[PDB]
Amino acid sequence: VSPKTYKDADFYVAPTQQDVNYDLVDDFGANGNDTSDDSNALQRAINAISRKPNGGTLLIPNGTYHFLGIQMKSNVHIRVESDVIIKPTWNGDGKNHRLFEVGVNNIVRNFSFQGLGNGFLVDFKDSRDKNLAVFKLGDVRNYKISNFTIDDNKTIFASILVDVTERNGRLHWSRNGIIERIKQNNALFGYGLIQTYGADNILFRNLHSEGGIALRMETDNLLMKNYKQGGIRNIFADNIRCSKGLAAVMFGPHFMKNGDVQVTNVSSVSCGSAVRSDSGFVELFSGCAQTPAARVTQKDACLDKAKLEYGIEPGSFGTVKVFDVTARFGYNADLKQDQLDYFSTSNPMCKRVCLPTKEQWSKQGQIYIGPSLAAVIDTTPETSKYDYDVKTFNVKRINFPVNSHKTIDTNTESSRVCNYYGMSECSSSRWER
Ligand SMILES: [Ca+2]
Ligand SMILES: [Ca+2]
Ligand SMILES: [Ca+2]
Ligand SMILES: [Cl-]
Ligand code: NA
Ligand code: NA
Ligand code: NA
């Protein structure tokens, strides 16, 4: 097969006329030379621009700014100078925080946030806040988020949450947008750059995450389960990359029935795999039940009962095709404990696999650092009425050791060769990167 084509205008349409062009510092008094909060200045700028019928552009000039909980609005187009550094303003309330919210508490249409030149920096390195996301998207359409680097510090939450929001008794989420040219450094394994919950017609392009997963299409927001609304459809991705992480692209529908997704040009360097697909599954709340929340065993006799009794069923994806996948072998990939047994073929002595210390990660066993395992991991139940397929084309591996796996699936044999809790401890340098 040949990938479907598209043009940027199929996702985002830029304004052709605007009413104003403001500067955050000169027009709204923000200060990029101190360490004080600039949120109000930015919010006033956004509000002022959105009040104009044809909106306008806001320039965030070179300097260091502190923002938190900014509410984006319609017809606001933010451009950021190339030497800008954006840091999260300290908030000790202990709640989940985001630098920018788009359509979470309102309706946003025609919005863009783009770095000029080679992009700017969002820096979390000096933040005492571990619950940080850069963008949380909700009811927003016709948008573009582009060009910046995120210096993470293994914070909780993916940097860009393509989420759902509740309003008037139902869920709302984004449609028609482009999220591109973003690099994330030092992400926590359980997160990464993008996590998608609800989305329609979004283009993800030139995204790279060091650690975790770059494009995590793991649709598991509880709200979507309760409302039976959400999921992603007609998603396009191009040039998605992973380094020292789990995977560049991952599919994990959980309980949600998602639509079509096309991905082209996926590359990984020292990641668990380049592409990873997890089986959809069902969970019951208080050989059909797993060790408990209680996940339902992957058996069509038990699942047929699940759909009958609870009406729920394992999530899935529609037509999914991933073209041009390249996985380059490395020794610093993020690995899950249930993947370690796959070293039985190429690494029987489990060499180069480290277990992070309690200081590095309290829940020992949730993450390991070691050699890449494959180009593609697909744990979807091939022999099941409840299954979806992620078709891969032109998959290639580089520098993998002899007898390593290319594609790990449900038929792949494995055996325990690693000492789960007694293996070598990860050095600080290796964990901290
Ligand atoms: Ca300031
Ligand atoms: Ca720059
Ligand atoms: Ca399958
Ligand atoms: Cl997340
Ligand atoms: Na001005
Ligand atoms: Na300037
Ligand atoms: Na985060």
Which long-range CB contacts under 8 A does 286-292 form with residues at least 24 apart?
none
Please list, in sequence order, all residues whose beta carbon lies within 8 angstroms of the beta carbon of residue 120, skipping any fewer than 6 positions away: 80, 81, 82, 83, 84, 85, 86, 147, 148, 149
Method of determination is X-ray
CA distance 375 to 269: 10
Residue extents of the structural domains in the chain: 1-433
Pairing type for strands 294-295 and 283-284 reads antiparallel
Task: Answer whether 21's CB lies under 8 Å from 48's CB.
Answer: no
On whether the CB atoms of residues 223 and 171 are closer than 8 A, the answer is yes
* Protein residues placing their CB within 5 Å of the ion ligand 1: 31, 34, 36, 38
Closest among 215, 287, 220 to 254, alpha carbons compared: 220
CA of 316 to the centre of ligand 3 (A): 9
Say if CB 320 and CB 396 are below 8 A apart: no
Task: Name every residue whose Cβ is closer than 8 Å to that of residue 169 and which is 6 or more positions away in sequence.
Answer: none
Distance from residue 190's CA to the centre of ligand 4 (Å): 8
Using alpha carbons, select from 141, 144, 148, 160 the residue that is nearest to residue 77.
144
Domain 1-433 CATH assignment equals 2.160.20.10: yes
Spatial distance between the Cα atoms of 304 and 301, rounded to a whole number of angstroms: 5
Q: DSSP secondary-structure letter at 392?
A: E
Query: Could you tell me if 80 and 60 are in contact, meaning their C-beta atoms sit under 8 angstroms apart?
Result: yes
Beta-bridged to residue 145, according to DSSP, are: 113, 179
Q: How far apart are CA 75 and CA 271, in angstroms?
A: 39
d(CA 58, CA 227): 37
Q: How far is the CA of 63 from the centre of ligand 6 (A)?
A: 9
Non-local (6+) Cβ contacts of 173 within 8 A are 137, 138, 139, 162, 163, 164, 165, 197, 198, 199, 200, 230
How many angstroms is it from 40 CA to the middle of ligand 1?
10
Tell me the two tokens of residue 4. 């479907």
What sign has the CA pseudo-torsion 99, 165, 314, 387?
Answer: negative
Strand ranges (E), 271-339: 275-277, 283-284, 294-295, 320-328, 333-335
